[PDB]
Structure 1
Amino acid sequence: GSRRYDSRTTIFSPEGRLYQVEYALESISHAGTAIGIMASDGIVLAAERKVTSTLLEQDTSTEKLYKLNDKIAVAVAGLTADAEILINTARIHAQNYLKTYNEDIPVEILVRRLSDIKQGYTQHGGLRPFGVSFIYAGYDDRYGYQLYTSNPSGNYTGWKAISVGANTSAAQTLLQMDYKDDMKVDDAIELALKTLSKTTDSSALTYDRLEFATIRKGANDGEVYQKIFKPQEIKDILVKTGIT
């Protein structure tokens, strides 16, 4: 019968590893680097677009940074198509929570449920896992500013500063070197860009090959604002830090 052609996506290796999860992580390691840095007064999301073409429409484009609700955003590393499936699910889960409790969903609860879906694809169903790693940047009134990452295994962890995709080894060393706890958003913005600028496989880091977003309390009195940076705004912040 059909047994002959079954890859068996949800099995263990002799060493006790999940083949398809390991190979999905190998896939993600070739994806454009995405960095999350959490400051005391906000969060930075920086992501490198995959080898841009000059005729790509840059301003009306979304590849890396997606909005889940007013308080939570994600940086993507891996298959974009896979990410959009999970993002639409996460967006619906957030609205289900708000409809039920009349309160915005706590960041970890959204992360856990999205990570629980990924886990499912590794244990049952006989389907390939989602070739996606997320950096979750969000705020709630319990833990304040939070950075999480999830990967195809469905395992998630919290971070002060983290990188996913390509050159995470090199990127994590540079973040570990220059990061400190009393750091401001404006300083975190500079760290995020400087890290990409050194770890990039490109000749020079330019505005057209970046996606940038901040989650500050920079709005008027005790409320959170999400800023998805425009091309011209990235061009200005890149000059202001002295990279171009």
Structure 2
Amino acid sequence: GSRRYDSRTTIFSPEGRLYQVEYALESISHAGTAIGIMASDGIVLAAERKVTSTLLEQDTSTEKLYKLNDKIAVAVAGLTADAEILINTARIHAQNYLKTYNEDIPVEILVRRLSDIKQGYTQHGGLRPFGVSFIYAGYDDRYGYQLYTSNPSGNYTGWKAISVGANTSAAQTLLQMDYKDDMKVDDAIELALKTLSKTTDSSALTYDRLEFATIRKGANDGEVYQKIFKPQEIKDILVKTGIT
């Protein structure tokens, strides 16, 4: 009845690589592309939506770029349902640390704890593990901008550029040839939108299939300002660059 049957996901794999985690990376690459480009003065963060349905009000509904707080924004690729739970968990964690110590949580600490929850699931949770990768674009004063990505494995790795979602290789290869260490945020805006269009099978990647955000310290009087760019503002900069 229940004794006989098994759907143990908590077998220690013989390859050293848990099979369930393998399939969750497949599933990530079905979901649209999200690109983190780290510059000295910010993180330029941009992700295409994967729906394209006309009846569907995509405009209103942000589904990939969620602002957690002032210095930290996350781009989602993966299962949107699984993702919702981790967004509330990540929001409450940064607030609790801010309350205890009166300092915005260093980026390192936040990313680590969230990765450790994913890990926990296959450690002895009995749970299927969340099949989501998140790029946490974060700032703190000490360490500058910091860029980390997570894996369904519960492992994070820092980078100066990363891609998740579809066309991981196509995007990564362009950024390596075109991005140089010293290009500023300003360049990266122009760079991001153009590489995305070229990976995607769409003839022009419309403004309405885009989500764009930046986290910058080049906001006056030594302050940090984020702005999730609204669909029509994406459109003007879409025309300049000649995609449209």
Q: TM-score range by the shorter chain?
A: over 0.9
| Aligned partner of residue 68 in structure 1, secondary structure | strand
Q: Identity rate of aligned residues, in percent?
A: 100
Q: Distance in 2 between matches of 1:46 and 1:148?
A: 15
Cα 1:153–1:3 shift into 2, 3 Å? farther
Preserved contact between residue 35 and residue 164 of structure 1 (Cα < 8 Å): yes
Cα 1:10–1:192 shift into 2, 3 Å? farther
Deviations 1:127-170 (A, max 9, x none): 11101001111110111111110011000011111110111011
Deviation at 1:104, TM superposition (A): 0.5
Cα 1:241–1:92 shift into 2, 3 Å? same
Preserved contact between residue 29 and residue 166 of structure 2 (Cα < 8 Å): yes
| Aligned partner of residue 148 in structure 1, secondary structure | strand
| Aligned partner of residue 180 in structure 1, secondary structure | coil
Identify the residue that residue 138 of structure 2 maps to in structure 1.
Answer: 138
Deviation at 1:57, TM superposition (A): 1.8
Q: Distance in 1 between matches of 2:90 and 2:157?
A: 17
Q: Distance in 2 between matches of 1:9 and 1:201?
A: 36
Identify the residue that residue 190 of structure 2 maps to in structure 1.
Answer: 190
Cα 1:156–1:243 shift into 2, 3 Å? same
Q: Distance in 2 between matches of 1:12 and 1:109?
A: 28
Cα 1:4–1:187 shift into 2, 3 Å? farther
Deviations 1:40-65 (A, max 9, x none): 11111110101321222233211111
User: Could you tell which deviates more after superposition, 86-95 or 211-220?
Assistant: 211-220
| Aligned partner of residue 158 in structure 2, secondary structure | strand
After superposition, the CA RMSD in angstroms is 1.3
Identify the residue that residue 230 of structure 2 maps to in structure 1.
Answer: 230
Preserved contact between residue 11 and residue 19 of structure 1 (Cα < 8 Å): no
Deviation at 1:194, TM superposition (A): 1.6
Cα 1:4–1:167 shift into 2, 3 Å? farther
Q: Distance in 2 between matches of 1:214 and 1:118?
A: 27
Deviation at 1:84, TM superposition (A): 1.3
Moved beyond 4 Å, runs of 4+ = none
Preserved contact between residue 135 and residue 147 of structure 1 (Cα < 8 Å): yes
User: Could you tell which deviates more after superposition, 88-97 or 183-192?
Assistant: 183-192
Q: Distance in 1 between matches of 2:112 and 2:241?
A: 36
Provide the TM-score with structure 2 as the length reference: 0.96
| Aligned partner of residue 10 in structure 1, secondary structure | coil
Preserved contact between residue 10 and residue 20 of structure 1 (Cα < 8 Å): no
Deviations 1:60-91 (A, max 9, x none): 21111111211101110001111111111010
Deviation at 1:218, TM superposition (A): 3.2
Preserved contact between residue 197 and residue 203 of structure 2 (Cα < 8 Å): no
| Aligned partner of residue 219 in structure 2, secondary structure | coil
Cα 1:107–1:202 shift into 2, 3 Å? same
Give the number of equivalent residue pairs. Answer: 244
User: Could you tell which deviates more after superposition, 26-35 or 49-58?
Assistant: 49-58
